[PDB]
Amino acid sequence: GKAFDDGAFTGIREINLSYNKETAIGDFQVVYDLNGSPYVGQNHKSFITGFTPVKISLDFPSEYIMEVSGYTGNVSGYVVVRSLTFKTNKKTYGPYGVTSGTPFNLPIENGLIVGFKGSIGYWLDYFSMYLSL
Amino acid sequence: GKAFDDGAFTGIREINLSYNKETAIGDFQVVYDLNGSPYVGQNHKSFITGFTPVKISLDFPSEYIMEVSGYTGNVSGYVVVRSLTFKTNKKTYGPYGVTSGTPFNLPIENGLIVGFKGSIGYWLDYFSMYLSL
Amino acid sequence: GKAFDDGAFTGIREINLSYNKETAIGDFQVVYDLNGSPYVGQNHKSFITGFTPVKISLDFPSEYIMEVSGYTGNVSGYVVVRSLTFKTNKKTYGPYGVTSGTPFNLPIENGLIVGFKGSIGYWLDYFSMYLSL
Amino acid sequence: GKAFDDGAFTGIREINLSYNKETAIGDFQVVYDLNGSPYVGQNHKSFITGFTPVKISLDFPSEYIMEVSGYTGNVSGYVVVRSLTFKTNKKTYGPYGVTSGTPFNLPIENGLIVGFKGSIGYWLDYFSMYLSL
Amino acid sequence: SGISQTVIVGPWGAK
Amino acid sequence: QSGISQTVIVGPWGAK
Amino acid sequence: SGISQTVIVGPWGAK
Amino acid sequence: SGISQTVIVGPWGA
Ligand SMILES: Cc1cc(=O)oc2cc(O[C@H]3O[C@H](CO)[C@H](O)[C@H](O)[C@H]3O)ccc12
Ligand SMILES: Cc1cc(=O)oc2cc(O[C@H]3O[C@H](CO)[C@H](O)[C@H](O)[C@H]3O)ccc12
Ligand SMILES: Cc1cc(=O)oc2cc(O[C@H]3O[C@H](CO)[C@H](O)[C@H](O)[C@H]3O)ccc12
Ligand SMILES: Cc1cc(=O)oc2cc(O[C@H]3O[C@H](CO)[C@H](O)[C@H](O)[C@H]3O)ccc12
Secondary structure, eight states: OEEEEOOOOSEEEEEEEEEOTTSOEEEEEEEEEETTEEEEOOOBOOSSOOOEEEEEEOOTTTOOEEEEEEEEEEETTEEEEEEEEEEESSOEEEEEEOOOSEEEEEEEEEOEEEEEEEEESSSEEEEEEEEEO | OEEEEOOOOSEEEEEEEEEOTTSOEEEEEEEEEETTEEEEOOOBOOSSOOOEEEEEEOOTTTOOEEEEEEEEEEETTEEEEEEEEEEESSOEEEEESOOOSEEEEEEEEEOEEEEEEEEESSSEEEEEEEEEO | OEEEEOOOOSEEEEEEEEEOTTSOEEEEEEEEEETTEEEEOOOBOOSSOOOEEEEEEOOTTTOOEEEEEEEEEEETTEEEEEEEEEEESSOEEEEEEOOOSEEEEEEEEEOEEEEEEEEESSSEEEEEEEEEO | OEEEEOOOOSEEEEEEEEEOTTSOEEEEEEEEEETTEEEEOOOBOOSSOOOEEEEEEOOTTTOOEEEEEEEEEEETTEEEEEEEEEEESSOEEEEEEOOOSEEEEEEEEEOEEEEEEEEESSSEEEEEEEEEO | OOOOOOEEEEEEEOO | OOSSOOOEEEEEEEOO | OOSOOOEEEEEEEOO | OOSOOOEEEEEEOO
């Protein structure tokens, strides 16, 4: 896949992703907050198209993510992120994708997600999150 | 179970835990680093006995934990932490306890685990980790 | 004067300021680093003209500020920032302005200046720095 | 003098220092907070005696230091910290010592002093502060 | 408050 | 508390 | 270095 | 390393 690394910002305003109900997560773009103003992140695109887009618009700053969860597993011989769910202090967004494979989940008791990095080929191959107070 | 919360420190020198392969993680205690000296955390003990002891002694500060992973599941009607693994930059310690139930895993690309909190009844019911630079 | 607040970033690439050899600091502007890209800060302009500009171009990321110092004092009856000096791990830039009144200094043993905020009327009225690891 | 470095803690509960009107600051000791419990810091003592002790007992956690200020100057051929003042959100403690020579000041807009380091011979020669959120 | 803050992740296990 | 991440800030120096 | 650091957790997925 | 880092300002004094 193609690696990407957004770095770290001041918080998160929107997540735009795409998925397919038979495969996995495809595209991923974040609108970060930077010092009280929107910063529209790079759109990290799958090598292929055909995905369903979702826009997750948070009521920043009072609404923020408290848990990221999902599943990883095999699609056409590649381990990819098959499913994502984002839980905020207000609501749950997801699951998007296919909820099979091996689960993972990052609940946050204190702190914020402030950035994402990862790699996307046909599907999201892997990802990490920047955390900060 | 009885809640514990060690708070946050400068690093981790050793973890003493116990487990039973029929059941789950039992005791949990940590020697932290506090500004260069060992800090002997309280021993959070299971309400029962019968556990096998494990001593994970780290080559501090050269050696530090890069991933904590494990399994949670139902034991005798209670959701508990059934297994733990600690990977450092030098080697892997575990798994301790049976690798059955729902996996979780926290890899760390940058940063340090500097503290533990949780609750222990007959078994480790849940835990969280303090992270810092 | 007019308040400004750049916010926090990843580092500093350049500082563009102006000063008068007979009065105080006037204009202040910073090119930050934001996750590997220059971020051109707004130019915070004095209400008056007649200053000498200075460009402090740092060899980012190997060169970074280790101490900000200077003087606050009276100009036309106003307490202003009369002078600034920036010392990096490579060299000293300044003093710029008038080295008179009450000295101040922020030496840094560990960490980085990642943002400025303050106010500018005819001269720089006051400022603050964001610090981070 | 003898260098000292307490490292970083959770906060500050009490500061004990001593001073002499004829000279400068003598001894320095901090009772820190560590994860909600008091932690009695090393007592950093002058090589000599005859100073006047002061105890600053803060109403932790609602009371915290917002500014530390002082003066440096020459005493018997040594440049030392001649005076200290500690301003909290509640009140000012000091000045203690001799307010002569070159001033310094560290105000804090956001964040907390969580530790001290420095050197003490016959007098407090210099010091630095750990800052955290 | 006068209390320093740290990131905490978790909990994993029971409610 | 908030979706806004926090940073240490020292200062101000100058007019109060 | 002059580059600010942040805690990073992950990755989850391949590799 | 395994040792946690913190911002440190100063020294003042000398
Ligand atoms: C389904 C399919 C069909 C095909 O003809 O080629 C590929 C190639 C694939 O690999 C790409 O996507 C992977 C998972 O995202 C991974 O990034 C790999 O490095 C990419 O080249 C995947 C699926 C195919
Ligand atoms: C297996 C078993 C056998 C028994 O005789 O009693 C108990 C009681 C248990 O409850 C306590 O431990 C739990 C799991 O750690 C949980 O903390 C609960 O709140 C406690 O009351 C568990 C297992 C038993
Ligand atoms: C020299 C001079 C003459 C005069 O008649 O008025 C002013 C007013 C000034 O005020 C502005 O600049 C101040 C210091 O920078 C401060 O910011 C104030 O709020 C501004 O209005 C300065 C000099 C004058
Ligand atoms: C004999 C004598 C008399 C006096 O008034 O002061 C001193 C100070 C001395 O040095 C010690 O204190 C210094 C200032 O704090 C400094 O730290 C030095 O390194 C210490 O050894 C020695 C003798 C004195």
